[PDB]
Amino acid sequence: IVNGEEAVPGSWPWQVSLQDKTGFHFCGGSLINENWVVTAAHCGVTTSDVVVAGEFDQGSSSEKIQKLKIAKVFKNSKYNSLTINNDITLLKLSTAASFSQTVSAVCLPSASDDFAAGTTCVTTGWGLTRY
Amino acid sequence: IVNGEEAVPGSWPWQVSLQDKTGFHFCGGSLINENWVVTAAHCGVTTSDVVVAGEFDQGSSSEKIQKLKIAKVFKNSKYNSLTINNDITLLKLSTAASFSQTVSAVCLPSASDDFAAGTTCVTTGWGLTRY
Amino acid sequence: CGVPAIQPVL
Amino acid sequence: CGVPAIQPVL
Amino acid sequence: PGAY
Amino acid sequence: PGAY
Amino acid sequence: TPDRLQQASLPLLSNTNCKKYWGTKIKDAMICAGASGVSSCMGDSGGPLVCKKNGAWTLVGIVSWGSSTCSTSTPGVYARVTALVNWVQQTLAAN
Amino acid sequence: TPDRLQQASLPLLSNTNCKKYWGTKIKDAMICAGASGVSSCMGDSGGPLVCKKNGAWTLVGIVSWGSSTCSTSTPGVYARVTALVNWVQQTLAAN
Numbered sequence: 001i002v003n004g005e006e007a008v009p010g011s012w013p014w015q016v017s018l019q020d021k022t023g024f025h026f027c028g029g030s031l032i033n034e035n036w037v038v039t040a041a042h043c044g045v046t047t048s049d050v051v052v053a054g055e056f057d058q059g060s061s062s063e064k065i066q067k068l069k070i071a072k073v074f075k076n077s078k079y080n081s082l083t084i085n086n087d088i089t090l091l092k093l094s095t096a097a098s099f100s101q102t103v104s105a106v107c108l109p110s111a112s113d114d115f116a117a118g119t120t121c122v123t124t125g126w127g128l129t130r131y
Numbered sequence: 132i133v134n135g136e137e138a139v140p141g142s143w144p145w146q147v148s149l150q151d152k153t154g155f156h157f158c159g160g161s162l163i164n165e166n167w168v169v170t171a172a173h174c175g176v177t178t179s180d181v182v183v184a185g186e187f188d189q190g191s192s193s194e195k196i197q198k199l200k201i202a203k204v205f206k207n208s209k210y211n212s213l214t215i216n217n218d219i220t221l222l223k224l225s226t227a228a229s230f231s232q233t234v235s236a237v238c239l240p241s242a243s244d245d246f247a248a249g250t251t252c253v254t255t256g257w258g259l260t261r262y
Numbered sequence: 263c264g265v266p267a268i269q270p271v272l
Numbered sequence: 273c274g275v276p277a278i279q280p281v282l
Numbered sequence: 283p284g285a286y
Numbered sequence: 287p288g289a290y
Numbered sequence: 291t292p293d294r295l296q297q298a299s300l301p302l303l304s305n306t307n308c309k310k311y312w313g314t315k316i317k318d319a320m321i322c323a324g325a326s327g328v329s330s331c332m333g334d335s336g337g338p339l340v341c342k343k344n345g346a347w348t349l350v351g352i353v354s355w356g357s358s359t360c361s362t363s364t365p366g367v368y369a370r371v372t373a374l375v376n377w378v379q380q381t382l383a384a385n
Numbered sequence: 386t387p388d389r390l391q392q393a394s395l396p397l398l399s400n401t402n403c404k405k406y407w408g409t410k411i412k413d414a415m416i417c418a419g420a421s422g423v424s425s426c427m428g429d430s431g432g433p434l435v436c437k438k439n440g441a442w443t444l445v446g447i448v449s450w451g452s453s454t455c456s457t458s459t460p461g462v463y464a465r466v467t468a469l470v471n472w473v474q475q476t477l478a479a480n
Contacts, residue, residue, distance in 0.1 A: 002329040002360045004298035011270040014263075014347075015295065018336060025291050026212045028337025030349055032263075036382060039336035040352050040369060042285050044175030046206050059293035074385070075177050076377050078319075081157045082259070082386075082427045084285060085317045087354045087369040089336075090381055100267075106338060107264035107348045108379075113372045115350050117304040121323060121341040122272070123353065123366075124297045127286060127334030128213070131360040133424040133455045135393035142280040145273075145442075146390065149431060156386050159432025161444055163273075167477060170431035171447050171464060173289050190388035205480070207472050209414075213291075213332045215289060216412045218449045218464040220431075221476055231277075237433060238274035238443045239474075244467045246445050248399040252418060252436040253282070254448065254461075255392045258290060258429030262455040264346030272299055274441030282394055283288060283315060283453050284358035286335035286366075287358050287410060288453035290430035290461075358453075 001125055009056040012124045014106035017052040018043060025058060028125045030106045034096040041079035041089045045070065051093060054103045058126060066103060069094040132256055140187040143255045145237035148183040149174060156189060159256045161237045165227040172210035172220045176201065182224060185234045189257060197234060200225040291333045298328040302341075302350075303365050311364055319373040321351050322365035330368075331360035339368045386428045393423040397436075397445075398460050406459055414468040416446050417460035425463075426455035434463045 016037055018027040029039035029051065037051055051068040071094035078086040097103055115121070147168055149158040160170035160182065168182055182199040202225035209217040228234055246252070300323045308322035316322065323339055324330070330337075330353045339351025351368025395418045403417035411417065418434055419425070425432075425448045434446025446463025 001296040001298045001334055002331050002362055003327060004296035007295045007297040008268060008271050009295070010268040011266055012295065012297065012338075012340075013266050013268075015337060020206075020208050020210075022208055024211075025333060027333070027335045028353065030338045030352075032349070032378070033382075038349070038352065038378065040354055042173075042175060042354070043336040044173060044206065044212065046177075046204050048206065048208075055295075057294045058291075072385075073177050074381050075151075075175065075179065076374065077151050077153055077179075078377070079151075080155075081175065083315070083317060084355050084367075086319045086374065088352055088374050088377070090378060092385060102268070104266065105263040106340060107343075107346050108375055109343070109348050109350060109372050111372055111375050113343070113348075115302055115321075115341050115343075115372075117302050117307065119302045119341060120299050121302060121339055121350060122270070122297055122299055122347075123323070123330055123334070123337065123339045123351070124295060125330065125334035125337040125353065126291045126293075126295060127337075127353075128331040128360060129292050129296065131331060132391040132393045132429055133426050133457055134422060135391035138390045138392040139278060139281050140390070141278040142276055143390065143392065143433075143435075144276050144278075146432060156428060158428070158430045159448065161433045161447075163444070163473070164477075169444070169447065169473065171449055173449070174431040186390075188389045189386075203480075205476050207469065209472070214410070214412060215450050215462075217414045217469065219447055219469050219472070221473060223480060233278070235276065236273040237435060238438075238441050239470055240438070240443050240445060240467050242467055242470050244438070244443075246397055246416075246436050246438075246467075248397050248402065250397045250436060251394050252397060252434055252445060253280070253392055253394055253442075254418070254425055254429070254432065254434045254446070255390060256425065256429035256432040256448065257386045257388075257390060258432075258448075259426040259455060260387050260391065262426060264340075264342075264348055266347070270297070272297075274435075274437075274443055276442070280392070282392075283312070283355060284332070285289060285355045286330055286332050286353055287407070287450060288427070289450045290425055290427050290448055 010102035141233035
């Protein structure tokens, strides 16, 4: 995020870090339940990548994070890589996340749900802070 | 390819089409042997996608194509999605391609191989012909 | 869901 | 490898 | 327009 | 600079 | 990428107004947000765009794409979750 | 996307000269080609960039990225296969 601010640790508990086997953070995701994570189809997740839940500071060896393995990747078959439309993938965990103060689910909207323009929402992540 | 030309059918026999389960072409790849295909890491291939070998005209029901299933995706762990560097994935086929006039392998270079600027090479594909 | 044990501060 | 049975025409 |  |  | 988790507040835009920036690249399963002095950027993809509805945070967008330079004056594009929730529900149920 | 397979001849550029277009986005495991009146475009990713060496076609590049509008005046970027062949050989051997 460019011009964001540091979050209070553990305050966005559904936020996970998608990392490769070397520990490199490449995308975010959200826990929607103990066994499933929603992320973008263009993230190109494979079952060799790791779901890291509970993390705040990626440079700390003393946080109690949860490194979870991925059982199966479900890329929405309507995802259109050319237009980046329907950019959604679901990840089924082989090891269920253990929900706690810092690890919990985000809510899903109803298909009929209304979020008006002008509404102030929040986005989180470990993406670039400057370009 | 923008401003390319139609190829002679079967003349680039290592070229495969990566399609989703619905038959939608989303990326190309190259057979390097009967059991393996090289493609880009950013293609985001999953084992639910299909390797189609032997195709020329995607609109034809009468071509003898080979639809092959993917056993495992090997995304190079040096691939860096942020910079698009080391953009390579290997696909191991569950069903080996059957090599014929129209289906065969491309050669790999030596790590020490030299391809000078100014050299005329060829690229192939079913990508967009206009933007 | 959607109710963090540790409240975000915006 | 790299030797197609049907020759490309460029 | 790059992917993120 | 878009991916292809 | 930063070591610590970042956050930012940003407003939702209309697809119509989003089109003023992105034109026809803006499809229906997408929602834009931002152009407010903040921007999602490389490495934020796949993470959440949440809106509080009836006191609970709800997933409205999935970080998807946007400016190649993370321009804060251009809106970021998110996968629109209301357009995809049906698919999520079916998958979770069949698996 | 076209139904039939397309092809195009295009010249290799130097990383140095490629940088004149793309700047620092150009890394060592990449090779540019084109800026010749042709361009790779969406849906071509992952396919081959082949050069004939000693009478045999050899994989030199993997279609990777380039202009958002497939501009024919800008070079396309390909994964540089000589920089990655070691990795291919190890994987094939261990699997």
